[PDB]
Amino acid sequence: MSGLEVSFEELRTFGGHDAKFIDSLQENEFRLYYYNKFKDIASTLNKAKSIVGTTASLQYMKNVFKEKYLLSEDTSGKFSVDKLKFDKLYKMLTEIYTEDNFVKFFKVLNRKTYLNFDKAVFKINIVPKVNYTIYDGFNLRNTNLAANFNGQNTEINNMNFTKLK
Amino acid sequence: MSGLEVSFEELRTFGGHDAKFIDSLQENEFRLYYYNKFKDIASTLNKAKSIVGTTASLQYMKNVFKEKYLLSEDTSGKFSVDKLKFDKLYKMLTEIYTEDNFVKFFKVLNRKTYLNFDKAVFKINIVPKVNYTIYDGFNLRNTNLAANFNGQNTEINNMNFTKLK
Amino acid sequence: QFVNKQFNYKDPVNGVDIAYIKIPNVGQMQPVKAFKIHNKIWVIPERDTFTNPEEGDLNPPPEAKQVPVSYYDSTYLSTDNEKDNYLKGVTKLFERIYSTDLGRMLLTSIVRGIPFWGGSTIDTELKVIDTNCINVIQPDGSYRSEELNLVIIGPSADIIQFECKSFGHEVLNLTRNGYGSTQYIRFSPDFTFGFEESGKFATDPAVTLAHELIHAGHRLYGIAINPNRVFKVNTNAY
Amino acid sequence: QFVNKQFNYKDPVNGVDIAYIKIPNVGQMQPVKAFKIHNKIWVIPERDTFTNPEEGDLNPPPEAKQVPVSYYDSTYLSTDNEKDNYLKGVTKLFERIYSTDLGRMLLTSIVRGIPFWGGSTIDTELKVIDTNCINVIQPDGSYRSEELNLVIIGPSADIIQFECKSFGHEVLNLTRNGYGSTQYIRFSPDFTFGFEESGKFATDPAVTLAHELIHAGHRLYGIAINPNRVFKVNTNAY
Amino acid sequence: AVQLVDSGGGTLQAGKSLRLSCAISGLAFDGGAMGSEHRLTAGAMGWFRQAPGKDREFVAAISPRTDETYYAESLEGRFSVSRDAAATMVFLQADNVRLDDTASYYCAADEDVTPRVMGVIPHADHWGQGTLVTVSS
Amino acid sequence: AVQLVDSGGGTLQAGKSLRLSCAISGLAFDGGAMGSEHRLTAGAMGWFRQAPGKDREFVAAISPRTDETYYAESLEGRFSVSRDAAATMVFLQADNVRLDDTASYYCAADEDVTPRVMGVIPHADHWGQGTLVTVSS
Ligand SMILES: [Zn+2]
Ligand SMILES: [Zn+2]
DSSP: OOEEEEEHHHHHHHOTTGGGGSOHHHHHHHHHHHHHHHHHHHHHHHHOOEEOSSSSOHHHHHHHHHHHTTOEEOTTOOEEOOHHHHHHHHHIIIIISOHHHHHHHHTOOOOSSSOOOOOOEEEOOOOSTTTOBTTTBTSOSSSTTSSTTGGGBTTTTGGGOEEOO | OOEEEEEHHHHHHHOTTGGGGSOHHHHHHHHHHHHHHHHHHHHHHHHOOEEOSSSSOHHHHHHHHHHHTTOEEOTTOOEEOOHHHHHHHHHIIIIISOHHHHHHHHTOOOOSSSOOOOOOEEEOOOOSTTTOBTTTBTSOSSSTTSSTTGGGBTTTTGGGOEEOO | OOOOSOOOTTSOOOSSSEEEEEOGGGOSOOOEEEEEEETTEEEEEEEOOSSSTTOOOOSOOSSOOSSSOOOBOTTTTOSHHHHHHHHHHHHHHHHHHHTSHHHHHHHHHHHHOOOOOBOOSSTTEEBOOGGGEEEEEOTTSOEEEEEOSEEEEEOOSBTTOOEEEEOOOSSSOTTTSSOOOOEEEEOOTTEEEEEEOOOEEEOOHHHHHHHHHHHHHHHHTTOOOOTTOEEEEEOOOO | OOOOSOOOTTSOOOSSSEEEEEOGGGOSOOOEEEEEEETTEEEEEEEOOSSSTTOOOOSOOSSOOSSSOOOBOTTTTOSHHHHHHHHHHHHHHHHHHHTSHHHHHHHHHHHHOOOOOBOOSSTTEEBOOGGGEEEEEOTTSOEEEEEOSEEEEEOOSBTTOOEEEEOOOSSSOTTTSSOOOOEEEEOOTTEEEEEEOOOEEEOOHHHHHHHHHHHHHHHHTTOOOOTTOEEEEEOOOO | OOEEEEEOOEEEETTOOEEEEEEEESOOOSSTTTOGGGTTSOOEEEEEEEOTTSOEEEEEEEOSSSOOEEEOGGGTTTOEEEEOTTSSEEEEEESSOOSTTOEEEEEEEETTSOHHHHHHTTOOSEEOOOEEEEEEO | OOEEEEEOOEEEETTOOEEEEEEEESOOOSSTTTOGGGTTSOOEEEEEEEOTTSOEEEEEEEOSSSOOEEEOGGGTTTOEEEEOTTSSEEEEEESSOOSTTOEEEEEEEETTSOHHHHHHTTOOSEEOOOEEEEEEO
16 A cells, blocks of 8 residues: 655644644544643652752742643642643644744745655855845845745755755 | 655556656566566467467467567567567556656646645546647647646636535 | 547447447446447446446445545436546547557557467467456347457546556466456546645646556556555655 | 854853863763853754764764665864854854744743653652753863753764754653653754755755754653654555 | 624725724733743734635734734735734724625634734634624625 | 767857768668558657756657657757658757757667657667767857
């Protein structure tokens, strides 16, 4: 049977159409799973009484992770995982931070799937502002490179793209 | 390990860049193999003395396959497989008759690999010369459909493309 | 012009190029009107509910079809009127492929690759193989078994599943041992697949028919490769 | 501006943001100059010949690398001059990603996701996990072990293999159990991959660094998925 | 109990001016999950619309505590987002209503996501009921 | 013993006319493998060239027994293929030689493949030794 063999992590990391391959079912399983892992961390904190390393006080270190995991704290100072705050953070880390979305933000040309079997590999040098800028990448504004992603074009901007073997 | 899982037949049938995935080694194995199979057929003919079915005479039927397989015939009337004539026919059937080459001949837009996971499927009707012609396909000459394969464009030629579900 | 006559589904049979037929390898089956558009090539404007015993059900399988898409509809290709449209459509596509040097060549190769006569139990005797013939009914009730290389037939349950079928022999693998065999192509000139570009396009149906004709060429010359002979290609990972 | 100082490889160490360091999980290893471009984020302008005991050989493996491409060169990233260029390049890319709302957010999340302190054998006690620290040498010979979340390091033997490594623990799977762990990214701002379009283009290196930073985010929050958890997608066949 | 109540719906003739309002309630817009430390670098109130038979598309959004706004490239010169200093209402205005606009409008709000991120992804935790807009001749 | 011998090589100035010849030998052009029944629907003699540092690209070809020809879209108005009725020689002519042409030219021949198929695939069983062409100022 022909087709492709893709990984969950890689697929999630890339986002875009690729991500639709993952069925609604495998999605919930993964979510609930990591949900439980966080609860386990909340439980480990609620139980902490001392601390080694010499870093700081159990007070500080506990606040640090309360922040890392967006934990809810009650009257007793006991931490708990908030479903909604969890979904948002999970969502944020797996659906929002994706290669595809970053592409929409850089306005550049890019592959449409994490998979690639091309043998084209180039040497470059982005340091010089004449070749690559923080805001325009290779496609320098108010330049011929400006539109049509000519800056990303191997032929048209052959100066910034020494091909290898 | 991520990637794709492709079939030899399908890959060969499509041709194009896809075909390069097959390494020089698997290519020779396949060739020699089928070479030997033909020799076997040549041997079966050289040995034929009678014939059932009532079709024609062993003379006719033998000439028919001498032609099908491009067999060489000697003084004794014994058939043999010609290496060169074999390579050309093998080449012809597996490297020349490809979907990709046919695309170069129809001047149409088409996928670049036999693999496809799209869910877009349309209903059409090529019979009426106003929709599709033997020489222009959907891209009718001296028409707006003419260039940019507008005729193959679902949006621009929405009349000849009822989408399904 | 590849197809001389111009067939019209309703045309009366003659047992030569328009006739009802039966396929030996189907056993009990109702005859089906067919059309001989060219030497060694026939067209059956019907839903393929007989090449495979497990067909006939123009309905969706038990659970789900393990593919991206699949379309079903049991009234497709049921009215003589539709059938005539089907016939006209396959005809044009053939003409389309023929209209090119590459298509003329392929079509020559197909018509030229008759399935080998190794159907005999004895080595010094040539015999036709039943899977490579069809029975053509004559206007009087006779029937003449005819040798053919290719049959274009309508799709099965899954309307959009195109394929190059073939009746296998008992022992040997005809499409892989050099012998070759009558090829049947499930196909429909009434549907096509789309694909993305910079842009929503549609595949030209002739290119699809080409793909299938290409498979057929391999098979008629017994040089096909086991469809299960797949291998793997790794990505560049990151 | 994401990276305040402007580092220059040749700058003298201070044991705070420019210093030679050692990684606990490497055992015997020569210290390597590093740069702290931001809170919890360091940069080591060296060829990664220590994260993995089986590296150090900037040479091609025995036979072949099971991938489409692979580049090798042992003099890459060896001259202080090149190293400085590397540092400048990674710096700009960071600024580039930071320059967007999405990049600012991700970078906040990374700097915010310190690896959990479950390195203790006793449940009522918090303890750092050695794999999540580095030893920063002071100008006097001391060394202060510091907690960090991310390290950008040069590529190994295969110059074009980019990856998000991580020192695993003994028992538990830090990148999958919620704890998270210091992420090391093998990367090079001096190379990029091309791809085809209607047209021969090149991937913007920032997008690649993004991909890796994204993996890192998952890992720092221990929510990554086993890289070996793959599944299959069938084509529509024909 | 977060709530979004769109309004200003009805119909108009090509060229007429339409004003849409959305009463948000239940959102503290105090820097979302991150915390008060993010009061000013987070949050978004905006508008989306769905053309009968078309996809839900983004229009524009403004920041709950700042003046930051973002418009779909396609519409900076045909629409204008506004907000009441209170940070409890959002307004979408437009004059010379084309027929291209005829559709259903929805207001969205996200505690911790910039108006730009809200527009490009797009993304939003809370949606409004939806208000129908239709132009004539 | 099939043989292909290109010639006409050397150098010229931009605008000068170049004539190339290729002596084929060992090919019966009698309808290739299919047979005499194909004498008229098969065979091809043409030209290919390789620009220093570029791919081998097709130029033009003519039929061995007919007048059929085919040119790379890019060159119908800058080149012209010819053949001697004998069917033992092929000629590529061109006037006003540009520098765009500077390259190595090769003649090809295939018993059973139309000149068009020879050009589009491209394909050819027999190649010539190759003759270098270079223009100046
Ligand atoms: Zn990855
Ligand atoms: Zn196929």
